[PDB]
Amino acid sequence: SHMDLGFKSGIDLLKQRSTVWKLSTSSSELDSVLGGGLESQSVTEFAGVFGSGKTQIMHQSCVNLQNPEFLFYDEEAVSKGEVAQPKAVYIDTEGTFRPERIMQMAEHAGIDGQTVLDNTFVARAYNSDMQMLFAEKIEDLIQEGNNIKLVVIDSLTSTFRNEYTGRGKLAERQQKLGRHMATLNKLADLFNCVVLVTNQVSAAEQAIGGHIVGHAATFRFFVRKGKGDKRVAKLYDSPHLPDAEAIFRITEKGIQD
Amino acid sequence: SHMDLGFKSGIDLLKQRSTVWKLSTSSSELDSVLGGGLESQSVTEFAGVFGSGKTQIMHQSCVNLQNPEFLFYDEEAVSKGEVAQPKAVYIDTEGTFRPERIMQMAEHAGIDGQTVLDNTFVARAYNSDMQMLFAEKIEDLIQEGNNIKLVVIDSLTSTFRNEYTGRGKLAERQQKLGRHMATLNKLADLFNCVVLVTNQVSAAEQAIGGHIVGHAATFRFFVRKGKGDKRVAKLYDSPHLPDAEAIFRITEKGIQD
Amino acid sequence: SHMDLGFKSGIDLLKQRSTVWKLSTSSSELDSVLGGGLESQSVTEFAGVFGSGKTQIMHQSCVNLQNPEFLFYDEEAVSKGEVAQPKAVYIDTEGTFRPERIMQMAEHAGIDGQTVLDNTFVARAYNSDMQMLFAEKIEDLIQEGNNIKLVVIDSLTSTFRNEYTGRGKLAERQQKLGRHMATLNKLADLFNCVVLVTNQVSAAEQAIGGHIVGHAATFRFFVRKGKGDKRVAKLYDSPHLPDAEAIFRITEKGIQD
Amino acid sequence: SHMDLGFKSGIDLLKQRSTVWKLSTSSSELDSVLGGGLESQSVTEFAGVFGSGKTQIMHQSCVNLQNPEFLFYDEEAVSKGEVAQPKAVYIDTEGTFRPERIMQMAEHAGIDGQTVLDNTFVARAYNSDMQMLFAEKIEDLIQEGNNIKLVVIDSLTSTFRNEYTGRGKLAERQQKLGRHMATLNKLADLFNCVVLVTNQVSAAEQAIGGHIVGHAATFRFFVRKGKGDKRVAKLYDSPHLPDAEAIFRITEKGIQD
Amino acid sequence: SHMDLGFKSGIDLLKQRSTVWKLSTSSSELDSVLGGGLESQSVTEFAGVFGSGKTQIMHQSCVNLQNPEFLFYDEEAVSKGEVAQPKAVYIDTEGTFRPERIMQMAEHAGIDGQTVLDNTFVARAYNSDMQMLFAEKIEDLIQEGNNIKLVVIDSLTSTFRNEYTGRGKLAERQQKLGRHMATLNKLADLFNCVVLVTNQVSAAEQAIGGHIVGHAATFRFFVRKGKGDKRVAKLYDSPHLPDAEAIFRITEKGIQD
Amino acid sequence: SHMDLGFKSGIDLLKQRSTVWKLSTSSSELDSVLGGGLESQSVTEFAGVFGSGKTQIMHQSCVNLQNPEFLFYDEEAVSKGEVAQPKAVYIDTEGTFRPERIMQMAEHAGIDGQTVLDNTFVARAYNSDMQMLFAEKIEDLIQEGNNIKLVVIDSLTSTFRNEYTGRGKLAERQQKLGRHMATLNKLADLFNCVVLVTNQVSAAEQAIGGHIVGHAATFRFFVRKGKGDKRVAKLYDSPHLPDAEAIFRITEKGIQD
């Protein structure tokens, strides 16, 4: 009864810790910094400038979800049915979803592009209202028998930024964002899935949204452009992992190395 | 089912791509820059100064909609009925609709002007509330048996600009705009129509409304005055078309060359 | 069913045009500048300083409405029944209605004063709420069988200006005003009557209200004080008439010359 | 029918003008400046500094209302029942009602003080909400069978000034005030009574409340202190009376000369 | 019927003055300056710095209410039944109620302390809403049969001051305060009880809350510290008493001299 | 009857004091400064910079709750039943709860860590709404049969601080804060339990939230860093204890000295 009130005993916390599964990024170093891969029941943020690869990682994650081998879990804790026919939701904030990139990534990966597209729900959000409502509707998707295992918010803050210009209404912006973050954390946890969000950085080195976002994101990264198609992801916040940097590349095959 | 919620599988996206039809502008160069013509399912923005041709293109579009040969589409994906007895909605926020100019453009196009007027609904909006409400009521018009295939918003921002003065209400202005842009995209998508919007520019060049408007418009142009009756439309934003310029003219015949 | 939704076809607009009737101002020059007289289906604004004659023109219009020979219309487009037993509504925001001036003007015009006073409804409005509500209640007067054919708002902006002092509530002011402008245009349109409004000006030359008012008034005048009882009305905005000035007098008889 | 809607024909306006009655102020010169006495159906304002005699005039009006001979009216237009058992309402905003002063003025005028106190309702208002609600409830007092013929608001702006400090809420204060003025004029008009209000002045020389109050007060005075107990009431605004000054005194007998 | 609407005839007002009773403060000088003691049907305010004795006066009053000889009234206007089993309500804003101080004052006064504690209702208010609701619930305590004859608000403004920072919120703070003052005056008046409030002062010399409070407090004191155990209460606002100072002391017995 | 209305007689207050129990902090000096231990029916605040020991005290309290020898109470006033099977609520605002730390503290204290984890409900709050709602839901946990005797709010203000930036919202922040403080006090009082909260400090040494928080917290500490693992807890606000400092240490066993 208590868990229905949003509470969890210390024992409930430990138990649920065993049902955590992870999704590979197709990058050795990146998976390593992640301590296995992208964790479920948590929100992972990739913040950087445009072209840094935040969106590539999002597309790559939708493809990988469709490869049974890219999902790592404790067999005696997570049944094979729990992760069967896994579906992905991609909330698109600026029209960044590219089906052809999904195909390309699928092909070079030996996955059926057709299947990734068929199992990835795309929601085009033109304002913060839609963005937040789509997130909440993910429960409805799961209620219609869709095993949503990956939620992608690309991007987390552009609609809020575009709607709240002026530090005179920043509090209203922060509260709405905090509400969205609670929703994102709620579905990662209640539906044992991984939630990923992309974000931008401001002038001195912080992801947009302040602490309201930061205190609510379990894993946080800054993504920088190396030379050429190289990228470096820096994990600077995680509950128990060490801060570390991982280098990788973005090619015709997607995320690699 | 998922579609009921606003989500589209990647496969659905590809499928909807096939039903996109285009409307000619009566200018080869502009049509070529558009990659064929003004696209259904998208919001196309024409931004420029007063007298730059924005309103003329809107009128030309209403006339052209009444000539079957001016609509281009895949006869394998779009039935004749889908585009039969097509009608236009012209939401006029400053009193720019001119039935006599419609008559003229039609006459010179070998199109009956009476037919254009009989199939063009004009909605005079004196404030932003009326403007947004009219846009929402387009669904009610369709539901009455009117095959709306062209929606013109001339102009998109004059009302919002006349109401929200001072950067102290900008947030509210931006949120109302975002709501309007969402509705415009919804009409274009759910009813497979072409949605055109005219807009102004501000001081190195930007269409009024910032990113809330920009991010939500699929095709964006800046229209400039050339010598005499000449004009140049510069497409600077599109999903996959190259950024190019097209020259054309505004004559007694309408848009030409 | 479309007109029920506030939409009108191009054809409906032309048909609309055929039923327009005009009201003489008693000034040959002003009538000429107007293209015959004050048009129904449009809002006509007279802006200027106190004493420029705006209020005098409003009273003169109420008197002239009671002279069948001062209403010009196409007999084959408008029945004598539509313009029969015409009544006026005068919404007064500063207590400028003078029954004695009505009497004096009538007498000197060979019109029965009592008939003018008996067919002129006066509404004293002390704030914008009353002002706007009276305008909306004009529809109710009509249902009860009153052939309202002339609506006077003297003055248009006095109350809004007295309530929304400070450019900090200007946005709300502009929106309330836009709502009122829409209602005034609706009365003129739906009930085929002439709507006149008085207004003030400010510096380097503009009627109070900005574009929210400007875009919503079809005929716009600046009225200036000439020498003695002479006045000059300058039409600087109309759909198709030329910009021109008219000189007249305000005498014991009312508007003349 | 049109009466229900707040509208009145020019004829009704003239008619109602015949039912106006006046209340003597006990001062010959002041009664003369007033054109006979304080008029019913109008709001009369007395603005001045503290100690200028405003409150004394309010008390003297409550006393005089109980002497049948201090009410002047057209016996052919106003019935004796209309002015029978007249009662006053004194809305007290700073605890200025003084029953002993009523007693003193009454006896010195040969009126039974007990009768005055017995027919004078006092409403102590501690904030603007109470002040306004009390004024609206005067209608309910009349609806219960009380012939309310005099309404005193002492003072009109006191509570508004105390509540709306800072000019960032001035618009809200001006609108609330405008709503209050509407109510005061409504009771004067609908129940044919005299409404008196006291007010303060500020820097040059203007009653507090601006035009919102000013356009809504039919007769306006500035009361000044003369030598000793002498006072001068200056009428600076009236519909058809000349602007003039009246000197009078405040003694044990009340207002005199 | 008029009283039901909040109005009172002038006769009513006089009838009410006769039922006024007073509560001794234990200080000869203070009682003399008050005209006999703390008056019922009025709000009495003691303003000053921390340690000036405001709270001690509140405590002494709760104790004194339980000694019949400390209540002064006219037997012909107030029945012994009306003042029998009197009870006090103490609204505590910072946790200043001290049962041990009550016991002490009682003991030294020959009054049973348990009787005092048993007949004193304490309400700990942590914010303005609770403070305001507690005052309104006093009516409910009375309806339940409790003869509430004294209400202490310690302090009047602490919560309001803690919740409202910025001159841009001052308007809302003043209106909430005005609503609270209305309630305090209403219970003093309707239930014939004495209402006491403590307040702070600010720079030049005024009690916090401005005129909204000042205009609504019938008796007002500034309480200063003298030498050692001495304190001076200065009555500077009363409807009919002279402005005067009372010196008293805060001792083990409580208030004395 | 009055208990329902939120009022407590002075006798109720004394009787209430009789049932207060205290919880050991495992620090002899700190327990001494506290007059015995953390008191039920009160809110105790620990303010200090990050790493000062606040969160550690919260964890140590959850652990100590499960050792009956650490709860001190009057057996004549409090039954073994009231404190039997006590449970704790830990509202986690930044993700600071650590089950492993709970295990370690228990283990080294001779307490079964599994028992502590099993009887401690954790609530992760990502915004002020959630934070406040969990607090209120504690009534539900108790209703469902859980003997909640310890409530931890870690931290009290990080969410409010992250949501309300700028002085233009400070009033709204203070009021939300006030409501939350009232709720915390209410559960401490009604369910006879200990309520602990952690807070930050700013600039000239004050806990965040100002007086709105300060006035509502019965025991207030500023916790600072000594040398190495030493810490000093300074009690600067209590109802009857002396202001004093207690040095303690944070080690593998937990809070000690």
From Swiss-Prot, chains A, B, C, D, E, F:
An example molecular function term from Gene Ontology annotations: ATP binding
Amino acids binding ATP: G48, V49, F50, G51, S52, G53, K54, T55
Keyword set includes Nucleotide-binding: yes
GO biological process, one term: DNA recombination
Keywords attached to this entry: ATP-binding, DNA damage, DNA recombination, DNA-binding, Nucleotide-binding
Protein role: Involved in DNA repair and in homologous recombination. Binds and assemble on single-stranded DNA to form a nucleoprotein filament. Hydrolyzes ATP in a ssDNA-dependent manner and promotes DNA strand exchange between homologous DNA molecules.
Family classification: Belongs to the eukaryotic RecA-like protein family.
Name of the protein in question: DNA repair and recombination protein RadA
Residues of the whole record sequence present: 61 to 322 of 322
